């Protein structure tokens, strides 16, 4: 898994692969690890995918509630708070890792957290297996004052580095751009270099190839 | 959380809640039971204010707590159910705990406290039900007849009735029953029962419902026909003079 | 001191009565007339939508006839809110019972379940009871169709047919008059509708003024089938009564 | 301390009545007349924004509030009661539904859920029923648009359209006059304007009046893009402009 | 029966008199106070009354600083004031703690209003007979004014006052604000805004005030604070000039 | 001592053309011991069906829990559940167990009734949501399954082709697991109807 | 471990239980009953954790009767099996889980059919023609897979049982000190006394 | 209606709690006692009413100390304030336990006022029948506080409670005018003694004893301590002269 995010000039964008695994085995060739906490606050996660999704759903719910309850727009920090506040309570036994970012009235924000409540902040962040590959891409080509496309382009490739050079990272490219001024845009499968070639053969079966002991029709309604 | 003490000594030292529960008992349709020499029979008037009911699915005013032990009562059908309940648990408990079903008394004394508790219990009212308890002890055929009341007091009776008019039929029973001669035959015991019954029931068979505990978890409720046959016979002997 | 404020719900009348229970029953008199019948082949459920209007939306609206289970649905006489509580609980209770035994609850068990729950407020808590009573319509393995009832006191009985709400005695009379044991559902349907139209306190008995349902083992079956009729269907069968 | 009022505060009258509820209804009837209308294309609700002083900033008070992107609510009665119920309603929706089902409950259940609360107030000790009733409109996938009315009785039922508060009788009267099935929201919107105008005594305008609809999903309001499945909230609140715009359209 | 008076339950008219009586204890302390959003700022002016020498006047305040940003002035029994302020103070930090940023003013009020709403509905809880006034410069809203009652009811205000003569001060500003047509004072310096209010305070009270006479507090960006008697007098100086 | 491995057995779903095919073996066993060739790992709620692999008693237990919940849902709903809703429900239920977790591979598939759309989903034991548009696999032989499916599968098969496809997919994979065997059942599922079938196989 | 054996023949269920009792080195009771009667038509046999397998058993037994007398009704083994599993399902996740492995034999009256359920301490339930626990079936099922026919009469399986027993008698290391043979049918439960010689 | 007083938390029709107001009754009835914040610090003065010779001198002690820097004294029902005092002793302990510092007087002041007011918040909670004059030297100077059952306390240049408070409040007002400078603790000691005797003139009907304690940033360093022996006897005769 490789999840990344980069604060750019007017905001921050995040990216992660669509690859999901069970150990050596790809769990989902195309999945979405990016998730909306609030329309302008989005997060993707590493470690337990169930956890990442689970907690995320929970927090944004509160966030939304809190947002409604405040009737003001969410603030990345409050989420950021709750997470560690939530997580740290679990002593990290919830193993989720989060690159969380968002644009809000206070502004654009980019944050990384780990299962135990450790929360970090920086213009560029990458987590997961191939994060190092990304982090390299980050450390090399990150500069201050990135554009959208700079943010797009840079984040684009860091993912690829993981995609290419990390086994846990691959499949397709998910992109959620969060810009201060505008609505966020979630780009699903934003890049899909990994398209499988056509199967060298069609393995479709002639009917009757299978021995059916018995057949019956399952009723649905009452 | 609601502790409020409903049951309290009157200026003259009474608990009217108890005393009023006695009224719902009286208000409760009369219930009666008598113990034959080997046996016990439980008469009950079906609340006749309504009809067209399905009596099959409608529970019997008498109910079994345990295979060898049954209970009948007079009072709010509600209050009974809870009482009915815990006793059922109790026997099973005693069964489980003591490797043995209860003595009729044992559960009886048990149930009594439950009422008796709710008396000096706070935040609850007492039950409005007085009960009659029937059963034959484990490895004992002997008739065991017990009368309890919301005050949580129990006792053994050669015969007993409860509910509305119970005094009336009691007077009947007091003379009609003889300790020196229990109506040994279930039927005659049933007979004496139904005799006592029409004394209140005011002419009904269905209005009447009967149950008999015999030894060793032998317990039977009687059909109106069986009832009516006695009703018929009883009437005759009366008519005869 | 708090004592000033306690209505002292559960305390006995000097006659050993519970006026709240009494009064709950009394509000139930005010409740919309609801009727049910155990036919030979099924059980009929019809109740008057009470306090109706033009812009009142009928279709989604059910204020009376609710389904606890596919073998147990109920008609409600009382506060709509209060029942829904018990409604939900019983469902769970049944579901639990189901989830316990993988088998449907014999109706009385569920009935007696709610029975004592009502009785819960009766004997303790200083808590007002529910102003609700119920028509319990259920099919079981054991007795097949079972038509039960309950009162806020929790006391409850079985029935070949029964009515609740207003005009009960009137209905009961009409019912205890016109009913016969072998009645088929469709007879009982109209019979109720007959009783309904007559026991209707308003001018006309109309679908939009009614909730209606049936428990029936269908012709193609082995699944005893509950059905609530749609307003039109009600309106349709409303015509079939000749009531039109 | 240690609340010793555990006993139900409202008790059945000798007549079998619950006076607090009745008095709640009384207070509810006292409530600012507020309406709702379920049209073909959607549902609209409306109420007069009550200013007890121009120094006070009306917008800072919202009598209409979104519960879910497809559900929002309004009342007639004591503002504060309405206030807290909103949060619970909001919360229970997330918790008891979304945090279970990951979405926003069908209008009925949430309504059914909300009313559940109000009942509890009636029953449990130490508490009184709330000083409001609720006109609740929502669209769900399967039941589409729907409009509900919840009392301090915790009773709730659907409407084709309705109004609560004082003039509601007169409103509902005119509503029944005006309402048809095939009303589209805008006319219904216009209708509500007409209707509430009657219930309106002092100034009648978007700054005096509170309007919102259950409309079609609003991707703009979704706050983000890129998700096909979610096209945004169906609910929206209407601007005094839009209001006064259609108050020209009067 | 008539206990409905004594407890919180709908009157036969659906009314809560304990609440309405709590509305009495509000002006019971008999302090006419006011709040106005300045241009960038918000100022609260209030009567500081010292009955006794033996008192410590400095210890006498109904204007309480809830947060770094949020001050609050209270109208009603000082204990409830001393009570309520802490409750608020608890919230913000916890809000700040939970939510990472200081509670915007309304939220507090919204939050606090709930409590009354709770007390409103709860019986054994009595409500507090204080009216609360929440202002600060909200980073999003700049100047903001919020006033809550024992009913759990509250609203924003272009400006507001509280006290026995609150009614008149209300009129005065309404007139002034209708005259101005603008919600907040145009004056950038709260200093003027203070003097402005005190003017209209003196005005609508027809009553002159010394440095001790007034309780004063100043909502500024990111900070609320209260003036000294000097600052007061300082304002009292210039008002004596313009007027 | 993998509670998943103790029962063994496996479950697969697929997305056919306008249809979906769910399958599991019928074998149950404790370790090398096989027990019930008659055991069934798939279940159905309204039009929404659930196969599950894992510790069986859990599957058994959970099976109720949803059936338990579904009704409560459906009754309140006055309508059957759609899978995607039910999807959340499962994950919620699972992650609710996050540190109490069942040992289960659950796989949810149906055809969305409103959209008329076929649907599949699959989970970890704590409720991580794996949704694919092709096939979902669960059970010890999952490794075999991908080998079959990811090779065999192609988009939008017709149910019987789909059936025939998922069949050999399952059948062959079954033999390549010890714990999966003893017959196989398939629900061929269409917007209207669902066809159940049994499949001859190696009974070793 | 002990030996819990059961078979659902055509019209009846036969339940067999090793009669031995062992604590460590000693065989304490060779006459032991390892089963408990849930109802007239419901018998339950069990092996497992010493205290538990007793405690749980009787515990459940009271429960059903309690419910039974409550409803004045004898439940389907199906529900009973259903019920029992639920207990295990909890207990296995309880603080100190039962270790118990049960056969519930039962004759459904409503179906007029015998019913034979196996549930592990894990609480995994299945109804079978025949079943066992632990090492028991490991020898037997072959013979059962070999011989068994559903129609097979009450007497027939007993023979098949004895053979299977003999297998265990032969192939199992630990002496089980004979077995009890009981039968659930339309008449409910009765013990066949004579089996080791049969 | 009426009887609003009859339950604590109830608002009077004018929005008041007469119980507290009634609690205030015995407060006045409480033994007249005063407190003074001198220049650096505070002084606590209380009359000890001698009921009988069987009373053992000096033994039953009114003024109570919280932590080591905070003295407290109250007119009212002794066990009340005592009960309260302990809670304060608790409060500071917790406070210091948390904050490692002895508690600021105002801090300490606040905490109680809540706890008192708490007893205004429930019809089942009996308000306090005492009003404590209390204070001491803290991080910033001293402070002089007297808390009412109302939950109201204030900073006090001088403070008095109980019967003779008027005679006191007189004298306190005077010394304020006599010494707007401040006052030396010694004179603070001395003057109070006079004040007490003067205050005693209301209760003059019986003999009493004089207890005075003090907290001096100088003399007690900021500790709170009694006035004793000669210095105690000094202010006595100092007053016992000046009283004539």
UniProtKB/Swiss-Prot annotation, chain A:
Compartments (UniProt record): Cytoplasm; Nucleus
Q: Assign the protein's first listed, main location to one coarse class.
A: cytoplasm
Q: What's one GO MF term for it?
A: threonine-type endopeptidase activity
GO (cellular component) term, any one: proteasome storage granule
Q: Name one Pfam family in it.
A: Proteasome
Which key words tag this protein in UniProt?
Cytoplasm, Hydrolase, Nucleus, Protease, Proteasome, Threonine protease, Zymogen
EC number in record:
3.4.25.1
Subunit-level organization: The 26S proteasome consists of a 20S proteasome core and two 19S regulatory subunits. The 20S proteasome core is composed of 28 subunits that are arranged in four stacked rings, resulting in a barrel-shaped structure. The two end rings are each formed by seven alpha subunits, and the two central rings are each formed by seven beta subunits. The catalytic chamber with the active sites is on the inside of the barrel.
Give the protein name, as stated in the record.
Answer: Proteasome subunit beta type-2
UniProtKB/Swiss-Prot annotation, chain D:
* Keywords on record: Cytoplasm, Isopeptide bond, Nucleus, Proteasome, Ubl conjugation
Q: Which InterPro entries match?
A: Ntn_hydrolases_N, Proteasome_alpha, Proteasome_alpha-type, Proteasome_asu_N, Proteasome_sua/b
The subcellular location is: Cytoplasm; Nucleus
One Gene Ontology CC term in the entry: proteasome complex
Cross-link Glycyl lysine isopeptide (Lys-Gly) (interchain with G-Cter in ubiquitin): give the residues: 108
> Which family is this protein grouped under?
Belongs to the peptidase T1A family.
Subunit annotation: The 26S proteasome consists of a 20S proteasome core and two 19S regulatory subunits. The 20S proteasome core is composed of 28 subunits that are arranged in four stacked rings, resulting in a barrel-shaped structure. The two end rings are each formed by seven alpha subunits, and the two central rings are each formed by seven beta subunits. The catalytic chamber with the active sites is on the inside of the barrel.
Described function: The proteasome degrades poly-ubiquitinated proteins in the cytoplasm and in the nucleus. It is essential for the regulated turnover of proteins and for the removal of misfolded proteins. The proteasome is a multicatalytic proteinase complex that is characterized by its ability to cleave peptides with Arg, Phe, Tyr, Leu, and Glu adjacent to the leaving group at neutral or slightly basic pH. It has an ATP-dependent proteolytic activity.
Descriptive protein name: Proteasome subunit alpha type-2
Origin species: Saccharomyces cerevisiae (strain ATCC 204508 / S288c) (Baker's yeast)
Q: What is the lineage of its organism?
A: Eukaryota, Fungi, Dikarya, Ascomycota, Saccharomycotina
Name the encoding gene, please: PRE8
UniProtKB/Swiss-Prot annotation, chain F:
Query: This protein is called what?
Result: Proteasome subunit beta type-3
* GO BP annotations, alphabetical order: proteasomal ubiquitin-independent protein catabolic process; proteasome-mediated ubiquitin-dependent protein catabolic process
**Keyword Cytoplasm on entry:** yes
Q: Which residues form a coiled coil?
A: none
What SUPFAM superfamilies does the entry give? Answer: N-terminal nucleophile aminohydrolases (Ntn hydrolases)
Phosphoserine modified-residue sites? 30
Cellular compartments annotated = Cytoplasm; Nucleus
Q: Single GO cellular component annotation?
A: proteasome complex
Q: Which InterPro entries match?
A: Ntn_hydrolases_N, Proteasome_beta_3, Proteasome_bsu_CS, Proteasome_sua/b, Proteasome_suB-type
Which UniProt keywords are listed?
Cytoplasm, Isopeptide bond, Nucleus, Phosphoprotein, Proteasome, Ubl conjugation
Its quaternary organisation is:
The 26S proteasome consists of a 20S proteasome core and two 19S regulatory subunits. The 20S proteasome core is composed of 28 subunits that are arranged in four stacked rings, resulting in a barrel-shaped structure. The two end rings are each formed by seven alpha subunits, and the two central rings are each formed by seven beta subunits. The catalytic chamber with the active sites is on the inside of the barrel.
A Gene Ontology molecular function term for this protein is: endopeptidase activator activity
Origin: domain of life: Eukaryota
As for family, the record states: Belongs to the peptidase T1B family.
Q: Annotated cross-link Glycyl lysine isopeptide (Lys-Gly) (interchain with G-Cter in ubiquitin) - which positions?
A: 69
Give one Pfam hit by family name.
Answer: Proteasome
**Source organism phylogeny:** Eukaryota, Fungi, Dikarya, Ascomycota, Saccharomycotina
Swiss-Prot record, chain H:
Q: What is its main location?
A: cytoplasm
Output the Gene Ontology terms for molecular function.
Answer: mRNA binding
Keyword check for Aminoacyl-tRNA synthetase = no
PTMs per UniProt: The alpha and beta forms are probably products of the same gene with different post-translational modifications.
Gene Ontology BP, a term: proteasomal ubiquitin-independent protein catabolic process
Q: Where in the cell is it found?
A: Cytoplasm; Nucleus
Q: GO CC: one term?
A: nucleus
Sorted alphabetically, the keyword list is:
Acetylation, Cytoplasm, Nucleus, Proteasome
What is the protein's known function?
Answer: The proteasome degrades poly-ubiquitinated proteins in the cytoplasm and in the nucleus. It is essential for the regulated turnover of proteins and for the removal of misfolded proteins. The proteasome is a multicatalytic proteinase complex that is characterized by its ability to cleave peptides with Arg, Phe, Tyr, Leu, and Glu adjacent to the leaving group at neutral or slightly basic pH. It has an ATP-dependent proteolytic activity.
What does the sequence similarity comment in the record state about its family? Belongs to the peptidase T1A family.
How does this protein assemble? The 26S proteasome consists of a 20S proteasome core and two 19S regulatory subunits. The 20S proteasome core is composed of 28 subunits that are arranged in four stacked rings, resulting in a barrel-shaped structure. The two end rings are each formed by seven alpha subunits, and the two central rings are each formed by seven beta subunits. The catalytic chamber with the active sites is on the inside of the barrel.
Please tell me what else the database record remarks about this protein.
Answer: Present with 12000 molecules/cell in log phase SD medium.
- Annotated gene: PRE10
Which portion of the entire protein is included? 5 to 248 of 288
